[PDB]
Amino acid sequence: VTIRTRKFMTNRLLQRKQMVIDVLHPGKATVPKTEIREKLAKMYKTTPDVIFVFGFRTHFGGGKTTGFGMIYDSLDYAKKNEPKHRLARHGLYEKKKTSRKQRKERKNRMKKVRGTAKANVG
């Protein structure tokens, strides 16, 4: 309902703006991050899917919620600099699931052979 932004650092090295979000929502549940992105994109004259928020902790008692948010210059700098789990929260990215134990068994079984056979030993 009400966004206040604590300490603001505009960051010319990673091409973003860095700030700490305050969210006052005194009669409601914890607000979704999509609504925070729409309110801050209406605040900073930019489009809502170049801005990325994370880590919102609701304080004890029903009061404010305080987390981080960063506003990028363009989506291509976002596809270079943002972490892949945070892009995958937006549907811009998806990981191939094996994930760790079948890869390790395929790593210790591809040591037993030599030549072109490493491709056709799975």
Partner: protein
């Protein structure tokens, strides 16, 4: 241990890096470099914890591989490169320049310098010898080896070098009456004018300093770094200017 070590835990790190206890088990080990392991700042500490340009440890690497950060006017891709005690850390994308200077609590400060000031640094000359058909050499405290020095330069002097070229512009001789900074032990960071040196055969020499307030201390001779000629400092200083206030006056100043 059957070889060199490659890791450094967090609670065994230096106190003046001001690390947490619960972010992880390990601290970044500084790379082998010009500066010692207990007496340096890596870049990953300096960009992540002091300036907050990068929140997590991968983003310091994403900063440094874009050839952004200059250490002494040279582009440095190692994120654990040691820097300290007037390494001029220069970032040209934002136009800022930083000189690593101990504040009077003993910690490496974020202390900003002028863009005209970042073409020089000071260096304490630690070893003077001759070589190889009489070529005189000079070894600074950050292991710059300079051939053909001024022949009045002796050990424990301070020279000023040009950071583009690597050549000596002028030098300061070690005396009483020069302004001084400590790089040292319990009296690390205090700035004053030298009053004495007691010379001992076979052991560390003790040098007595008197401050701008007039309170006096003394440290060993390997901890004394001459800043300037006379009482004129040659660099930009931190905002307290090296005067150690006691815990009573520091509480009264915080009041």
């Amino acid at each position: 241990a059957r070889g060199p070590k490659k890791h450094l835990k967090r609670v065994a790190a230096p106190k003046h890096w001001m690390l947490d206890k619960l972010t992880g088990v390990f601290a970044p080990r500084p790379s082998t470099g010009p500066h010692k392991l207990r007496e340096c700042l890596p870049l990953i500490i300096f960009l992540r914890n002091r300036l907050k340009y990068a929140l997590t440890g991968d983003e310091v690497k994403k900063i440094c591989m874009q050839r952004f950060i200059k250490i002494d006017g040279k582009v440095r891709t190692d994120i654990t490169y040691p820097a300290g005690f007037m390494d001029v850390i220069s970032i040209d994308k934002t136009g800022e320049n930083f000189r690593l200077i101990y504040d009077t609590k003993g910690r490496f400060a974020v202390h900003r310098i002028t863009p005209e000031e970042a073409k020089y640094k000071l260096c304490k000359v630690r070893k003077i010898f001759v070589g190889t058909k009489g070529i005189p050499h000079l070894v600074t405290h950050d292991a710059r080896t300079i051939r053909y020095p001024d022949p009045l330069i002796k050990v424990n002097d301070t020279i000023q070098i040009d950071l583009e070229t690597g050549k000596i512009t002028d030098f300061i001789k070690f005396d009483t009456g020069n302004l001084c900074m400590v790089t040292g032990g319990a009296n690390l960071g205090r700035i004053g004018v030298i009053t004495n040196r007691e010379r001992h055969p076979g052991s560390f020499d003790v040098v007595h300093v008197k401050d701008a307030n007039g309170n006096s201390f003394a440290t060993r001779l390997s901890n004394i770094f001459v800043i300037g000629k006379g009482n004129k400092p040659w660099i930009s200083l931190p905002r307290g200017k090296g005067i150690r206030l006691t815990i009573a006056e520091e509480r009264d100043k915080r009041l």
